[PDB]
Design a protein around this ligand. Sequence first.
Ligand SMILES: [Mg+2]
Ligand SMILES: [Mg+2]
Length: 673
Amino acid sequence: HLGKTEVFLNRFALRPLNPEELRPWRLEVVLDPPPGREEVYPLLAQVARRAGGVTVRMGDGLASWSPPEVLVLEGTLARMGQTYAYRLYPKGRRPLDPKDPGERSVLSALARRLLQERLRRLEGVWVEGLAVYRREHARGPGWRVLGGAVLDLWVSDSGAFLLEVDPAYRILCEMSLEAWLAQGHPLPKRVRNAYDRRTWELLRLGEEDPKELPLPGGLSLLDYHASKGRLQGREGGRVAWVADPKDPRKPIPHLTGLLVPVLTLEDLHESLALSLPWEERRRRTREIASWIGRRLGLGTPEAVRAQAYRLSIPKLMGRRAVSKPADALRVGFYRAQETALALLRLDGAQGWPEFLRRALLRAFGASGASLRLHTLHAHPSQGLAFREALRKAKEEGVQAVLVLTPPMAWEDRNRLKALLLREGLPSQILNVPLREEERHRWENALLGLLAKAGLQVVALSGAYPAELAVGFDAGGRESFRFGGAACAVGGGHLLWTLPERIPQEVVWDLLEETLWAFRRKAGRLPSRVLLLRDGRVPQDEFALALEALAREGIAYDLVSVRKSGGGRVYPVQGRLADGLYVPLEDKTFLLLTVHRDFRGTPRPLKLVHEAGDTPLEALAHQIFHLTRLYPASGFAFPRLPAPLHLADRLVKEVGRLGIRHLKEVDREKLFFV
DNA sequence: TGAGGTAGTAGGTAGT
Ligand SMILES: [Mg+2]
Ligand SMILES: [Mg+2]
């Protein structure tokens, strides 16, 4: 809807840049030996770092704000095994105009460097990047959570500085990998060099003797680090096998004593609370923004106000107009089919719980379809017969199994599902001390169960620019060269697609198959596809996919999503509403997807239209709606669009169960929710 | 396993 509201950003306008800042000093750079085309840019950057002061790369040369003789006009740096001799020559001043995209960038680069150079000269504070930490929030054996704020400072076309401030924490590991393991914690997924910044993937530990491991040189693992003086101050422990994130499938030996665990919120199981109420955070933010302008000398800050547009509330329906997915059990659903469900009471009496058996019929009646509820009489004990039962039952048309068991132990949960999966039957689990009085649990269970059986419970109705929206998920990696999985939404259809090595191949392969399955279920290829991916993924991993789409005349729109750190939104006067769309920049925009995002403060999505020609408003609209299109959880909507939310589960479970691939589970069957 | 939000994590052809 055009012109509805205004909101406060996580931003603050500050004093304008003085004339001297608008005309930084330009420094000429001389490298010896002369570099190679693609090696100039890095080297330059590196030099701007060595020279010190507030200086950055500008073209083939440099630009600084600090005077020529504060800077290190001469020096040397060794990049990639080759040592160079740099030499700077002050070649006067040169003005820049923030109203030019080109020069504007140099000005914002300059700003960021200033923000951290001024910042770095502050007592009582740890500065990691463009972030500041001033207090200990929580601390335990081997770890500590720091409290601060992540900042950013750039220049506005208006010509003034602009500070972005969002208070946040930092999980720190204060001990080596060896020490940490020695405490009984599980192996960390990520680990970094005790001696520098480099991080790797922790694969295994090894019984291998550090003194036996021979390296490509004929030198010894232990000796190698010993020869680098890394064993002077640290005790190397055992042999840790690590992997370089750029090639996770090539093992690299290493020592646990020289590695530090990269702790994630998960590694600290059980209790610190890192959230913050929207009104508290908004306060801490203002007190940090003011703190900076004072000590930094950027002027008093003024909270930025931006235009916001409320998108229309999604009209989602089953057979009838519904409000939450769960209302489809009473009113009936969108697309019904003949489906046979099986029961697996694997600890109890036997027999379908009165109300479920009632609710089931209750829904198909309101839908008008044939329902056949069978029973599975077997057990993990009687394996051979258990499979005999599964093989028989599925052959009878059973398409989904509702496993009614007491709180299972993880390991056996995957085991059970896995066995069920292999011989063709998805499975929904509902713990067994069941009370009919709790219709939030079994309704959700029935909701998933039906999804797993391949029944569309709800769909949308609108004039969306995309006929198909497919989101991609590469696990928690930043490249599709490891795994990757996909989920599309479309007659509404919900299909999943798994890997059948170059990343661009993986992507065009998740995409093609999605197009093929879609062509089978809809008899047609889509006119336009909406591509949704996680922002922290090179956009080049989609180059091949885009050429293919164009090559077959299929319209598209690539949109990167930023789950965390996209900024925050505060109401000027009133409340925040769902689907609040905040245009924000060239091609980017913020989208608030869930209003009651909790005990802390809502985290809006940050989207970037990287390819295609569709109004940002058009996209926002569809993307916000895809949000209410998620089958499970018929009482709460996902922050992310069904496509991205489903791909995340599709990946998580593909690893939970470690499934290589499924012959058939008809792709309409959402086994992973 | 009923499900979701807030929160933080990957720094934002050598090396071992
Ligand atoms: Mg189906
Ligand atoms: Mg489920």
